Scaffold this active site. Structure first.
Site, PDB file in Angstrom:
ATOM      1  N   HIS A  47      -0.628  -1.599  -3.480  1.00  0.00           N
ATOM      2  CA  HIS A  47      -0.837  -3.027  -3.317  1.00  0.00           C
ATOM      3  C   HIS A  47       0.267  -3.855  -3.966  1.00  0.00           C
ATOM      4  O   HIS A  47       0.570  -4.955  -3.481  1.00  0.00           O
ATOM      5  CB  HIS A  47      -2.211  -3.451  -3.823  1.00  0.00           C
ATOM      6  CG  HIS A  47      -3.322  -2.982  -2.951  1.00  0.00           C
ATOM      7  ND1 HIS A  47      -4.387  -3.777  -2.610  1.00  0.00           N
ATOM      8  CD2 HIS A  47      -3.525  -1.809  -2.320  1.00  0.00           C
ATOM      9  CE1 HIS A  47      -5.196  -3.116  -1.804  1.00  0.00           C
ATOM     10  NE2 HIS A  47      -4.696  -1.922  -1.610  1.00  0.00           N
ATOM     11  N   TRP A 164       2.113  10.734   5.430  1.00  0.00           N
ATOM     12  CA  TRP A 164       2.396  11.393   4.165  1.00  0.00           C
ATOM     13  C   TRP A 164       1.830  10.613   2.991  1.00  0.00           C
ATOM     14  O   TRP A 164       1.285  11.197   2.046  1.00  0.00           O
ATOM     15  CB  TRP A 164       3.900  11.589   3.991  1.00  0.00           C
ATOM     16  CG  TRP A 164       4.524  12.443   5.075  1.00  0.00           C
ATOM     17  CD1 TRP A 164       3.884  13.305   5.924  1.00  0.00           C
ATOM     18  CD2 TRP A 164       5.908  12.473   5.452  1.00  0.00           C
ATOM     19  NE1 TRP A 164       4.781  13.871   6.790  1.00  0.00           N
ATOM     20  CE2 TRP A 164       6.029  13.373   6.525  1.00  0.00           C
ATOM     21  CE3 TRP A 164       7.060  11.818   4.983  1.00  0.00           C
ATOM     22  CZ2 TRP A 164       7.241  13.644   7.122  1.00  0.00           C
ATOM     23  CZ3 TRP A 164       8.262  12.099   5.578  1.00  0.00           C
ATOM     24  CH2 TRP A 164       8.345  12.992   6.629  1.00  0.00           C
TER      25      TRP A 164
HETATM   26 CA    CA Z   1       4.524  -6.820  -5.584  1.00  0.00          CA
END
Ligand code: CA
Ligand code: HEM
Ligand code: CA
Ligand code: ZN
Ligand code: ZN
Ligand code: ZN
EC number: 1.11.1.16
Length: 318
Positions: A47, A164
């Site tokens: 994130h 992956w």
């Molecule tokens: Ca960032």
């Protein structure tokens, strides 16, 4: 080089990381376990890093999700990241490391606690973040394969690299997809970095583990496991299905590809040549425990084979 406490590292500048390692292993990872906080810290690496778009902005793996938490933790896709951001903040404040470095360091240390895991290359020296990520840069489980691949591609990842990176879902759970069943894992071995995720996502769905109508969720094969719509689709769509199946019972490939692609992710928005290699601070992971298998009672006919070229390998059930 030899650090003040006698531990060694190739570059003396890396010695600053040893006290940080010790602190997080004890006080973030519950004594070097592959548990909740490892899972959350690994999600945080993504994130933070995926907030990177040539078109839309964002500085990638820059610590922005901490530095600009007031903005980023309110994005819908950051639902339930806010706990780990709050937990990591005091470590950043006390150790004189940039937030971007800390996020990637914690993620790499955490993964190294997981049997079967890898030592993700780690580089020190990211400058402090200077902008918040834009919203809508984190893929959602209700996004189509085309949408996900386009977003990841925008950040620099090929379709096979997305597969992956999704080895991360081998050591992962969901708290917000179905809030009636928080902490439900994506595979049967959330403490083991293995191919069970790639196997179990290929099984025919059977049941909803909690409630039956959550956005971005499809049936799971097992009580006590949750299945994302995105993972369901990536395992079956012609663009990614053959690569997905190639991970099954291929521990060396999962290891090699995850480590290398995570290094790429950890460096989004950064220039390796301006950083220092501190890879040898990261602990050596334990070897895999267990071996690829179908769940007890299942058979090969429960596998939804999606690679026309190559039959699914002949696994046995527990
Ligand atoms: Ca960032
Ligand atoms: C490719 C598209 C992806 C989608 C749509 C996706 C979606 C999700 C969702 C919906 C959750 C559960 C959040 C919750 O309800 O608590 C989750 C958890 C997680 N994701 Fe992914 N993800 C993707 C890629 C990645 C990548 C590239 C990483 C690499 C670091 C990653 C690592 C994780 C981890 C470790 C968790 C577990 C978090 C925990 O246990 O709290 N994900 N992901
Ligand atoms: Ca696993
Ligand atoms: Zn804990
Ligand atoms: Zn938590
Ligand atoms: Zn498609």
């Amino acid at each position: 080089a030899t650090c003040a406490d006698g531990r060694t590292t190739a570059n003396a500048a890396c010695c600053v990381l040893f006290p940080i390692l010790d602190d997080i292993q004890e006080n973030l990872f519950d004594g070097a376990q592959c548990g909740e906080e490892v899972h959350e810290s690994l999600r945080l690496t993504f994130h933070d890093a995926i907030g990177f778009s040539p078109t839309l902005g964002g500085g990638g793996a820059d610590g922005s999700i901490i530095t600009f938490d007031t903005i980023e933790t309110n994005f819908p896709a950051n639902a339930g990241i806010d706990e780990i951001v709050s937990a990591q903040k005091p470590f950043v404040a006390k150790h004189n490391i940039s937030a971007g470095d800390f996020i990637q360091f914690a993620g790499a240390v955490g993964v190294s606690n997981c049997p079967g895991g890898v030592r993700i290359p780690f580089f020190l020296g990211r400058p402090d973040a200077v902008a918040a990520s834009p919203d809508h840069l984190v893929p959602e489980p209700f996004d189509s394969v085309d949408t996900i691949l386009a977003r990841m591609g925008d950040a620099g990842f090929s379709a096979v690299e997305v597969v992956w990176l999704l080895a991360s879902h081998s050591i992962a759970a969901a708290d917000k997809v179905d809030p009636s069943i928080p902490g439900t894992p994506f595979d049967s071995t959330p403490g083991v970095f293995d191919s069970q995720f790639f196997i179990e996502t290929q099984l025919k769905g059977r049941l909803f583990p909690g409630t039956p109508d959550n956005k971005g969720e499809v049936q799971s094969p097992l009580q006590g496991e949750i299945r994302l719509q995105s993972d369901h689709l990536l395992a079956r769509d012609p663009q990614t299905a053959c690569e997905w199946q190639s991970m099954v019972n291929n521990q060396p490939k999962i290891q090699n590809r995850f480590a290398g692609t995570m290094s790429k992710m950890a460096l989004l928005g950064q220039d390796k040549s301006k950083l220092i290699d501190c890879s040898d601070i990261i602990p050596t992971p334990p070897a895999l425990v267990g071996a690829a298998h179908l769940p007890a009672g299942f058979s090969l006919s429960d596998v939804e084979q999606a690679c026309a070229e190559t039959p699914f390998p002949a696994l046995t059930a527990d």
